[PDB]
Amino acid sequence: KDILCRLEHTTLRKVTANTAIYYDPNPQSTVVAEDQEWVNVYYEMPDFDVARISPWLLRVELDRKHMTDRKLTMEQIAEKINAGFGDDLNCIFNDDNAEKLVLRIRIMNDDDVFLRCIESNMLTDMTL
Amino acid sequence: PGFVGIRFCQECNNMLYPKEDKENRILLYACRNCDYQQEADNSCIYVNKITHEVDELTQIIADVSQDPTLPRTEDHPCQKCGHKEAVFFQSHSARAEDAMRLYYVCTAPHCGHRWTE
Amino acid sequence: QEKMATNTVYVFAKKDSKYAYTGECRSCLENSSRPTSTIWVSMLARGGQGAKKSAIGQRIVATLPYIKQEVPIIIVFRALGFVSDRDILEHIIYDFEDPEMMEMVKPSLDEAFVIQEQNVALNFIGSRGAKPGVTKEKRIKYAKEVLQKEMLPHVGVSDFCETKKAYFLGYMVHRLLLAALGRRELDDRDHYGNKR
Amino acid sequence: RKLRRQMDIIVSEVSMIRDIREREIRIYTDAGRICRPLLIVEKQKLLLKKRHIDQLKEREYNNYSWQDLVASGVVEYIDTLEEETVMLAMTPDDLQEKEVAYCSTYTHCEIHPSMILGVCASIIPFPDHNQSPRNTYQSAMGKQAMG
Amino acid sequence: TVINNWLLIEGHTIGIGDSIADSKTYQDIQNTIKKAKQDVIEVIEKAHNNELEPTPGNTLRQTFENQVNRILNDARDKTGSSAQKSLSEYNNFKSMVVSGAKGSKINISQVIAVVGQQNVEGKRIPFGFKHRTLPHFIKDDYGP
Ligand SMILES: [Zn+2]
Ligand SMILES: [Zn+2]
What is the three-state SS of chain C?
CCCECCCCEEEECCCCCCEEEEEEEEECCCCCCCCCEEEEEEEECCCCCCCCCCCCCCCEEEECCCECCCEEHHHHHHHCCCCCHHHHHHHHCCCCCCHHHHHHHHHHHHHCCCCCCHHHHHHHHHCCECCCCCCCCCCHHHHHHHHHHCCCCCCCCCCCCHHHHHHHHHHHHHHHHHHHHCCCCCCCCCCCCCEC
Contact, B40 vs B27, CB < 8 A?
Answer: yes
Contact, E65 vs E72, CB < 8 A?
Answer: no
Task: Name the residue among E76, E95, E92, E94 with its Cα closest to residue E84.
Answer: E94
Chain centre to alpha carbon of residue C146 = 13
Q: Give the domain CATH number at C163.
A: 3.90.1110.10
Contact, C111 vs B12, CB < 8 A?
Answer: no
* Structural domains of chain C, count: 1
Verify that B34 and B57 share a domain, yes or no: no
For D52-85, what is the HEC assignment? HHHHHHCCCCCCCCHHHHHHCCCEEEEEHHHHCC
Strand order in the sheet with B46-49: A89-92, A101-107, A56-62, A16-23, B46-49
Verify that B56 and B23 share a domain, yes or no: no
Verify that B114 and B71 share a domain, yes or no: yes
Work out how many CB contacts closer than 8 A connect C with D.
Answer: 22
Q: Is residue C1 part of a domain?
A: no
- Pairwise CB contact (< 8 Å): E64 & B100: yes
Verify that B63 and B22 share a domain, yes or no: no
Spell out where chain A has E strands: 16-23, 56-62, 89-92, 101-107
Task: Name the residue among B64, B56, B111, B53 with its Cα closest to residue B88.
Answer: B64
Strand order in the sheet with B72-73: B72-73, B86-89, B103-106, B114-116
Contact, D82 vs D89, CB < 8 A?
Answer: no
Distance CA(C158)–CA(A17), nearest Å, equals 51
Contact, A88 vs A44, CB < 8 A?
Answer: no
Does any CB of chain D come closer than 8 Å to the CB of residue E115? no
Resolution of the determined structure in angstroms stands at 3.9
| Residues ≥6 apart with Cβ < 8 Å to C108 | C43, C57, C58, C59, C60, C72, C73, C74
Q: Is residue C3 part of a domain?
A: no
Tell me which method was used to determine the 3D structure. cryo-EM
Q: Give the domain CATH number at B79.
A: 2.20.25.10
User: What domains does chain A contain, in order, with CATH numbers?
Assistant: 2-128 (3.30.1360.140)
Please report, as a single letter, which amino acid is at residue D144.
Answer: Q
Verify that B18 and B58 share a domain, yes or no: no
* DSSP SS3 for B34: coil
Distance CA(C31)–CA(A114), nearest Å, equals 53
Verify that B56 and B106 share a domain, yes or no: yes
Helix (H) or strand (E) holding A69: helix A64-69
Domain boundary among B48, B64, B83: B48
Q: Is residue C2 part of a domain?
A: no
Contact, C192 vs D32, CB < 8 A?
Answer: no
**Segments in chain D forming alpha helices (H):** 50-57, 66-71, 80-83, 92-95, 132-142
Contact, C50 vs C99, CB < 8 A?
Answer: no
Q: What angle do CA E28, E29, E33 make, to 5 degrees?
A: 115
Q: Is residue C59 part of a domain?
A: yes
Contact between chain B and chain A (3 or more Cβ pairs less than 8 Å apart): yes
- Pairwise CB contact (< 8 Å): A113 & C54: yes
The backbone torsions φ and ψ at residue D95, rounded to the nearest 5 degrees and listed phi first, read: -115, 20
- Check whether B9 is labelled as a binding-site residue: yes
Count the neighbouring beta carbons within 10 Å of the beta carbon of residue C94. Answer: 13
Verify that B59 and B44 share a domain, yes or no: no
Which of A88-97's residues contact partners 24+ apart within 8 Å by CB, and which partners? Answer: A89/A118, A90/A45, A90/A51, A90/A52, A92/A36, A92/A37, A92/A39, A92/A40, A94/A36, A95/A36, A97/A36
- Pairwise CB contact (< 8 Å): E129 & D84: yes
Verify that B32 and B81 share a domain, yes or no: no
Q: Which domain holds residue C176?
A: 8-196
- Check whether B12 is labelled as a binding-site residue: yes
> Please, is A77 exposed, middle or buried when counting C-beta atoms within 10 Å of its C-beta (0-12, 13-18, 19+)?
buried
Between D20, D106, D107, which is nearest B64 by CB? D20
Nearest bound ligand to the CA of residue B106: 2
- Check whether B44 is labelled as a binding-site residue: no
Q: Which domain holds residue B84?
A: 49-117
Count the neighbouring beta carbons within 10 Å of the beta carbon of residue C101. Answer: 21
Residues within 8 A of B (CB atoms), C 112-131 only? 113, 116
Q: Is residue C159 part of a domain?
A: yes
Which chains does D contact via 3+ CB–CB distances below 8 A?
A: B, C, E
* Structural domains of chain B, count: 2
- Pairwise CB contact (< 8 Å): E52 & B90: no
The backbone torsions φ and ψ at residue E86, rounded to the nearest 5 degrees and listed phi first, read: -135, 50
The backbone torsions φ and ψ at residue B39, rounded to the nearest 5 degrees and listed phi first, read: -75, 135
Distance CA(B6)–CA(B17), nearest Å, equals 9
Please report, as a single letter, which amino acid is at residue B42.
Answer: N
| Residues in chain A closer than 8 A to B1 (CB atoms) | 18, 20
| Residues in chain C closer than 8 A to A114 (CB atoms) | 53-54
Verify that B69 and B54 share a domain, yes or no: yes
Does any CB of chain C come closer than 8 Å to the CB of residue D34? yes
Chain centre to alpha carbon of residue C74 = 9
Verify that B61 and B17 share a domain, yes or no: no
Q: What angle do CA D113, D117, D118 make, to 5 degrees?
A: 150
Verify that B64 and B33 share a domain, yes or no: no
* DSSP SS3 for D38: strand
The shortest C-alpha distance from C190 to chain D (Å) reads 12
Distance CA(A40)–CA(A38), nearest Å, equals 5
- With an 8 Å Cβ cutoff, the interface of chain B facing chain D consists of 61, 63-64, 66-69, 71-72, 92
- Pairwise CB contact (< 8 Å): B64 & D21: yes
Strand order in the sheet with B37-39: B17-20, B27-30, B37-39
Verify that B54 and B72 share a domain, yes or no: yes
Q: CA–CA distance from D73 to each of C144, D7, D78, D87, D109 (Å)?
A: 49, 9, 13, 18, 14
| Residues ≥6 apart with Cβ < 8 Å to D60 | none
| Residues ≥6 apart with Cβ < 8 Å to E77 | none
| Residues in chain C closer than 8 A to B18 (CB atoms) | none
Nearest bound ligand to the CA of residue B77: 2
The shortest C-alpha distance from E36 to chain D (Å) reads 18
Q: Is residue C21 part of a domain?
A: yes
- Pairwise CB contact (< 8 Å): B98 & E49: no
Contact, D14 vs D31, CB < 8 A?
Answer: no
The shortest C-alpha distance from C124 to chain D (Å) reads 34
Instruction: Report the number of secondary-structure helices (H) and strands (E) in chain D.
Output: 5, 6
Q: Is residue C27 part of a domain?
A: yes
Please report, as a single letter, which amino acid is at residue E40.
Answer: V
Does any CB of chain C come closer than 8 Å to the CB of residue D67? no
| Residues ≥6 apart with Cβ < 8 Å to A51 | A45, A90, A108, A109
Contact, B41 vs B18, CB < 8 A?
Answer: no
Which chains does A contact via 3+ CB–CB distances below 8 A?
A: B, C
In DSSP terms, B89 is beta-bridged to B103
